[PDB]
Amino acid sequence: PVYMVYVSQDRLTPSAKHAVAKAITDAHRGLTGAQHFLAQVNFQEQPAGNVFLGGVQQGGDTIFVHGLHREGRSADLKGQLAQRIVDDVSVAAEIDRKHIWVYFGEMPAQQMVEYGRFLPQPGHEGEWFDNLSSDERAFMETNVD
């Protein structure tokens, strides 16, 4: 998965940012089973007053999570994972839940490419990880906090 996480400029300190990433990443790991280093969190900072709700300019507290996942998982699982993101971001970022929107879009795994390679289908990530070369495993191996 890639998680586009839109936030106001400077709303998240580096460590705040770190904690929101580890919050999402862990939630995805805990729920899907996918290994950490497949979970990308991409922060998109914009200056305050760029978001608008019902046509009302907003300060700097809004958080929009756009998760892009592989097709394959159930409605129930995705709502658990969306709910856990609303809750664990709320805490990691010290922002009210009322401030957090979370959308999940899905695409066939076979039109999705990470570390230069097409993803496997959900739940069969491990045999996938194993048929990668030495250098590719090493690189992804590093990306586990």
Add this chain to the structure above:
Amino acid sequence: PVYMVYVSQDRLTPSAKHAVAKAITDAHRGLTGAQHFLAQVNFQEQPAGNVFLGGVQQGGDTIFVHGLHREGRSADLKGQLAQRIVDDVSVAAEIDRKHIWVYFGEMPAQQMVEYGRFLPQPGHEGEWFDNLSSDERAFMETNVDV
């Protein structure tokens, strides 16, 4: 809905952004009936020159509207709302129509969240609002323009 709006830096003043954010929101409200406040308009500004069309760098007039919706609305409707976004953003950003691109994406309501809560289908806008805690109902209230 969340309308992501990709614009070149300084192409829209604060007041330009309002008129755009109000044009999109009014189009969505009027055409869907979904209550005003549910629509977020989110500007992503980049330096001018970060947009290429067929490999040619552009100035700062290009606007891309990515619209992220619940599934359930007909194609004829989605066509209307995209055409009216194109016209109403054009007026409001003082920008020619050829410069405006508009994609709509659809996800199930069950995997979309707003104001920390899980959205309903387009056919449940008013009853959903009524199973909300009064503090949420009053917070969303403040998010309706004028």
Add this chain to the structure above:
Amino acid sequence: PVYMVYVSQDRLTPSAKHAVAKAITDAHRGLTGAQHFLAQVNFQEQPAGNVFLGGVQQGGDTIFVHGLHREGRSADLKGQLAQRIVDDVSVAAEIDRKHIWVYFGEMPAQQMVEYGRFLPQPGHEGEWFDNLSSDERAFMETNVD
């Protein structure tokens, strides 16, 4: 197509950005037959450290390509196109494959407007072009390289 390209700030020199947009656009015109001027490359630049893999802050080397297409193409063509984008962006921007992510999301053309007009079905680019006003025809023909 719109291709959203999420790069760390200043990693692509202007010259690189140009090469990276030319290559994606050449890839998409080669494999799908759509005319050049139909392909947008939208570069999104964030400060390095905004990208997290497995919850680990990254340097400025990650490239996430998010392509937005018509529905219409086969899983086979789309993996060709994705794979050609990885290899070509690699060369163009001088970045190992391991750093490149590519997601293809698709939508019905009837909710898809470029240059102020709804796009046709993939492969009907010819007659749709042969129905645009002379000014529109002239305008788009400007954006080909």
